[PDB]
Design an enzyme around this catalytic site. Structure first.
Site, PDB file in Angstrom:
ATOM      1  N   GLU A 357       0.186  14.411   5.924  1.00 18.49           N
ATOM      2  CA  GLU A 357       1.342  15.200   6.337  1.00 18.49           C
ATOM      3  C   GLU A 357       2.527  14.307   6.691  1.00 18.49           C
ATOM      4  O   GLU A 357       3.683  14.653   6.409  1.00 18.49           O
ATOM      5  CB  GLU A 357       0.965  16.100   7.513  1.00 18.49           C
ATOM      6  CG  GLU A 357      -0.129  17.119   7.195  1.00 18.49           C
ATOM      7  CD  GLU A 357       0.286  18.144   6.153  1.00 18.49           C
ATOM      8  OE1 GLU A 357       1.504  18.331   5.940  1.00 18.49           O
ATOM      9  OE2 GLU A 357      -0.610  18.765   5.544  1.00 18.49           O
ATOM     10  N   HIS A 487      -4.849  31.243  -2.763  1.00 24.55           N
ATOM     11  CA  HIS A 487      -3.711  30.996  -3.643  1.00 24.55           C
ATOM     12  C   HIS A 487      -3.500  32.134  -4.632  1.00 24.55           C
ATOM     13  O   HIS A 487      -2.357  32.439  -4.990  1.00 24.55           O
ATOM     14  CB  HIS A 487      -3.895  29.674  -4.387  1.00 24.55           C
ATOM     15  CG  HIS A 487      -4.015  28.486  -3.485  1.00 24.55           C
ATOM     16  ND1 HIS A 487      -5.098  28.288  -2.656  1.00 24.55           N
ATOM     17  CD2 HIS A 487      -3.187  27.433  -3.282  1.00 24.55           C
ATOM     18  CE1 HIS A 487      -4.932  27.165  -1.980  1.00 24.55           C
ATOM     19  NE2 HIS A 487      -3.781  26.626  -2.342  1.00 24.55           N
TER      20      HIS A 487
HETATM   21 ZN   LIG Z   1       0.628  20.851   2.606  1.00 27.19          ZN
END
Ligand SMILES: [Zn+2]
Ligand SMILES: *[C@@H]1O[C@H](CO)[C@@H](O[C@@H]2O[C@H](CO)[C@@H](O[C@@H]3O[C@H](CO)[C@@H](O)[C@H](O)[C@@H]3O)[C@H](O)[C@H]2NC(C)=O)[C@H](O)[C@H]1NC(C)=O
Ligand SMILES: *[C@@H]1O[C@H](CO)[C@@H](O[C@@H]2O[C@H](CO)[C@@H](O[C@@H]3O[C@H](CO)[C@@H](O)[C@H](O)[C@@H]3O)[C@H](O)[C@H]2NC(C)=O)[C@H](O)[C@H]1NC(C)=O
Ligand SMILES: *[C@@H]1O[C@H](CO)[C@@H](O[C@@H]2O[C@H](CO)[C@@H](O[C@@H]3O[C@H](CO)[C@@H](O)[C@H](O)[C@@H]3O)[C@H](O)[C@H]2NC(C)=O)[C@H](O)[C@H]1NC(C)=O
Ligand SMILES: *[C@@H]1O[C@H](CO)[C@@H](O[C@@H]2O[C@H](CO)[C@@H](O)[C@H](O)[C@H]2NC(C)=O)[C@H](O)[C@H]1NC(C)=O
Ligand SMILES: *[C@@H]1O[C@H](CO)[C@@H](O[C@@H]2O[C@H](CO)[C@@H](O)[C@H](O)[C@H]2NC(C)=O)[C@H](O)[C@H]1NC(C)=O
Ligand SMILES: *[C@@H]1O[C@H](CO)[C@@H](O)[C@H](O)[C@H]1NC(C)=O
Ligand SMILES: [Cl-]
EC number: 3.4.17.23
Lengths: 596, 193
Positions: A357, A487
């Protein structure tokens, strides 16, 4: 005035007007995601609607500048991005219905519960109950119950909503001068105007298939090895020549075979490099984890995290009084505001994902000087590829030792290397046929090549043939198992993970060659390499200003995705599997089923 | 009779760059140590003359220009820059002889709701000459169609406000800027031991 100059001044006005509106929307949605209340959700929706109205006004405005008369590629790109009619090309009622069904699918996915028939008071939703079962249970019947309950409950609800979703999305994409919604999604990779770097929307299909063909043998051998190892775990349930039952793969879908490591470890005699206990015994916290990640990024020539980052990020669960959304996210709010939202635990997985991240955040910081509409990754795979090369470097035992979480006297046998590579492969190569098959099914459905009366038929035919996975119980057209994945039921493209997986090993090879690394690639730690840092920053600073092919060439020397970096990363495990499968069947029949 | 540099430095309200404010300083003693023995400033860059040896120099008069700009735009307050601020709001001559000083004022010039008072000019035909100043709020005509005072297509209001909030990055945080220019005539006034 020239048409190009009028468009340039329009874009200046747009950038300066849009910075503040996007920042307000980001602040509101952040206040929601870090403090879920009704005031916060209403403020988030207000700011988002304001931003969407401004965007549609600017779209209808930018459509008044004739694209054909623009000779500047950057302003041409920005103009096209603004001119995208998007959902607006729908009638009012159809747009309302499309947003309605999108939110409905998202709700039933994130809220669906299945109850135990043996104990009807115990009911679990997908997270954390059913996932805990699919990850840790060794009971065939319990795993089968979880798998089939999830599908026959939430996917049955999702089926008609998904049919209407398909028809409305195809209406939108066709009205926006595309072939279908799959063509729209593949448009993310399109480059049109730069000689020698162009890329059509079908070239993506050609390239993905051409590279999956070369991936096929390594996956076949990993599949054979895992099949034998699972035969030892579920005797009389698995054929030595058949596909793997879909409910024994380690999670709800088989997207990652990570949780099969306890059942498939090559050399269980060796100790596993899990540094969680070391982190806990050294009294590490999320502060220390992110500080170590920051030191890693500075060690390669990149800037610190901003004091605004350290002041505004939320790195721990705020507790019972303040409930928040814990999906790890890297926020680029604009106006130099960068944050990370993560409910960090003191674990090795969270250490690596913090590196990932913060790599996202470094990308965002690097392209901050670009104009607004150009502050984005080269394509949809670049951010995750960057995060993943960060996490690989952090996961190497050399780095883990240098940080002091692994003992200096940890012996790196030729068996620890195969252990590490097998655990890496279960996740990285185990997911590639899954990703490609899911996106192929989605593309074909959008293209109208799979009729509604054989959606699930073709889905499981492709599962068997391509992925080597077979359903434990038969499913008619009432089910909608693809939509039982986040998704799919939340309108996110999926080929990004395939493309990013190839990109990340291209990047790893390039940056480790820059770091003068010599051993096997999987042993590479790019720490302390200002050369590798510079070579990566040269690509990060571009954002979406240059074509993704040119951006990839700037770092790896190739205008297209390549699989030999991945295959060279996994070559030792490949030869070890070829030896381990000498008296085992490699391949699978598509016809055997756990039922008759 | 000491020059009140404090009146422009420790001033309560600062002006917008598009309407930067100029204060003349004539005959008076001018202590510059009150400025140079301080780490309060973020930049403090001088041109054409030594930054600290100003005390033993005498000038005909001293001009203090003041305004407020976003942190990333401070780079443009220098001779020979070419950004939006430098071209449309405040230009310095190539032969500039003076000092630019800036300090971060997030605490006083940024509010949680958002301070949109400080503005800047975004559109203008031709650049500003050195030390020029434009306060016009006439609708900027981009295309060939006349604007007739109404804002619209290819007709943009020339001013844009900074959005100063305490969570903005350092590059987007407000900085107060004072430019001290030194004039030279064959006339006599500002020494300052
Ligand atoms: Zn991500
Ligand atoms: C397409 O149009 C853009 C304008 O948006 C052109 O990019 C711009 O080019 C000018 C001059 O090369 C850049 O100005 C420069 O600013 C720096 C700032 O320090 C200064 O040092 C230089 O002396 C120069 O004045 C401007 O920044 C740049 N804009 C952006 C957003 O990069 C671009 O060149 C045009 N494309 C083609 C192919 O001509
Ligand atoms: C390359 O990056 C690594 C990653 O941190 C750096 O390694 C570690 O650097 C620290 C301080 O520079 C060393 O700390 C010292 O360790 C000794 C041995 O225990 C201790 O007695 C000292 O009191 C001090 O804490 C640490 O040992 C070192 N680790 C390793 C494996 O070398 C390294 O400095 C970087 N190399 C560069 C930038 O050239
Ligand atoms: C704006 O106001 C501040 C204070 O509100 C002024 O700073 C103050 O300046 C005086 C004199 O420069 C400092 O007093 C002392 O001066 C003697 C002189 O010998 C020196 O030896 C001491 O070390 C000390 O500097 C005072 O400490 C200082 N206060 C602060 C908080 O910095 C400032 O000068 C005003 N701005 C202008 C442009 O005058
Ligand atoms: C979490 O959100 C609430 C509002 O959604 C924040 O504000 C609280 O509620 C009202 C809103 O104006 C105030 O009058 C209260 O004083 C606020 N606090 C409490 C405890 O109710 C609240 O501040 C947010 N939490 C944090 C930590 O910022
Ligand atoms: C990144 O930040 C660290 C600290 O946050 C900087 O480290 C400095 O290190 C020594 C003592 O540890 C001193 O120079 C300073 O006290 C530290 N800085 C601070 C802010 O306390 C480091 O130099 C920074 N590096 C970059 C590239 O910004
Ligand atoms: C967007 O929709 C409008 C109809 O409202 C249409 O006239 C215009 O051509 C569309 N834009 C594109 C690029 O097709
Ligand atoms: Cl499925």
């Amino acid at each position: 005035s020239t048409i190009e100059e009028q468009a340039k001044t329009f874009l200046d006005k747009f950038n300066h007007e849009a910075e503040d509106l996007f920042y307000q929307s980001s602040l509101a949605s952040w206040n929601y995601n870090t403090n879920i209340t009704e005031e916060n959700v209403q403020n988030m929706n207000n700011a988002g609607d304001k931003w969407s109205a401004f965007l549609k006004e600017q779209s209808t405005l930018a459509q008044m500048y004739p694209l054909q008369e623009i000779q500047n590629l950057t302003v041409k790109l920005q103009l096209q991005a603004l001119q995208q009619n998007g959902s607006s090309v729908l009638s009012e009622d159809k747009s309302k219905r499309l947003n309605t069904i999108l939110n409905t699918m998202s709700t039933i996915y994130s809220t669906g519960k299945v109850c135990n028939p043996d104990n009807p008071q115990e009911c679990l939703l997908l997270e954390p109950g059913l996932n805990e079962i699919m990850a840790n249970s060794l009971d065939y019947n319990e795993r089968l119950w979880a798998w089939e309950s999830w599908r026959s409950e939430v996917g049955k609800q999702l089926r008609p909503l998904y049919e209407e979703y398909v028809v409305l999305k195809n209406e939108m994409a066709r009205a926006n001068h595309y072939e279908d919604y799959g063509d729209y999604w593949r448009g993310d990779y399109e480059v049109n105007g730069v000689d020698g770097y162009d890329y059509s929307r079908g070239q993506l299909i050609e390239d993905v298939e051409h590279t999956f063909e070369e991936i096929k043998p390594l996956y076949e051998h990993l599949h054979a090895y895992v099949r034998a190892k699972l035969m030892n775990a579920y005797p009389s349930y698995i054929s030595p020549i058949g596909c793997l039952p879909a409910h024994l793969l380690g999670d709800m879908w088989g997207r990652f075979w990570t949780n099969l490591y306890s059942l498939t470890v090559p050399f269980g005699q060796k100790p596993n490099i899990d540094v969680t206990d070391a982190m806990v015994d050294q009294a590490w916290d999320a502060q220390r984890i992110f500080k170590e990640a920051e030191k890693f990024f500075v060690s390669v020539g990149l800037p610190n995290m901003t004091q605004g980052f350290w002041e505004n990020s939320m790195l721990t669960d705020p507790g019972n009084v303040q409930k928040a959304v814990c999906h790890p996210t890297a926020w680029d709010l604009g106006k130099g505001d960068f944050r990370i939202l993560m409910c960090t635990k003191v674990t090795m997985d969270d250490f690596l994902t913090a590196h990932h991240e913060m790599g996202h955040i470094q990308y965002d910081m690097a392209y901050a000087a670009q104009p607004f509409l150009l502050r984005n990754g080269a394509n949809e795979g670049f951010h995750e590829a960057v995060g993943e090369i960060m996490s690989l470097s952090a996961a190497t035992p050399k780095h883990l030792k240098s940080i002091g979480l692994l003992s200096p006297d940890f012996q790196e046998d030729n068996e620890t290397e195969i252990n590490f590579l097998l655990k890496q492969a279960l996740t990285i190569v185990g997911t590639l046929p899954f990703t490609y098959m899911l996106e192929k099914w989605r593309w074909m459905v959008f293209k109208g090549e799979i009729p509604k009366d054989q959606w699930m038929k073709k889905w499981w035919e492709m599962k068997r043939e391509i992925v080597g996975v077979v359903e434990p119980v038969p499913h008619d057209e009432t089910y909608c198992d693809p939509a039982s994945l986040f998704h799919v039921s939340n309108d996110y493209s999926f080929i990004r993970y395939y493309t990013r997986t190839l990109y990340q090993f291209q990047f790893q090879e390039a940056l480790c060659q820059a770091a003068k690394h010599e051993g096997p690639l999987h042993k590479c730690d790019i720490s302390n390499s200002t050369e590798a840092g510079q070579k990566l920053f040269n690509m990060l600073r571009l954002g979406k200003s240059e074509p993704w092919t040119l951006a990839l060439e700037n770092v790896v020397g190739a205008k297209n995705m390549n699989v030999r970096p991945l295959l060279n990363y996994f070559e030792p495990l490949f030869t070890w599997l070829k030896d381990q499968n000498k008296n085992s069947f490699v391949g699978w029949s598509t016809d055997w089923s756990p039922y008759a | 009779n000491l020059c009140p540099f404090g009146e422009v430095f420790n001033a309560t309200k600062f002006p917008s760059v598009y309407a930067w404010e100029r204060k003349k300083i004539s005959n008076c003693v001018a202590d510059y140590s009150v400025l140079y023995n301080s780490t309060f400033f973020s930049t403090f860059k001088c041109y054409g003359v030594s930054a600290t040896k100003l005390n033993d120099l005498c000038f005909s008069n001293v001009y203090a220009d003041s305004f407020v700009v976003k942190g990333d735009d401070v780079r443009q307050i220098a001779p020979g820059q070419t950004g939006v601020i430098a071209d449309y709001n405040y230009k310095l001559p190539d032969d500039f002889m003076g000092c630019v000083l800036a300090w971060n004022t997030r605490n006083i010039d940024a509010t949680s709701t958002g301070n949109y008072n400080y503005k800047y000019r975004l559109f203008r035909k031709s650049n500003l000459k050195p030390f020029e100043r434009d306060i016009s709020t006439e609708i900027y005509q981009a295309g060939s169609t006349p604007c007739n005072g109404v804002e619209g297509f290819n007709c943009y209001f020339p001013l844009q406000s900074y959005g100063f909030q305490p969570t903005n990055g350092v590059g987007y945080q407000p900085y107060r800027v004072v430019v001290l220019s030194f004039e030279l005539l064959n006339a006599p006034t500002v020494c300052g031991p």
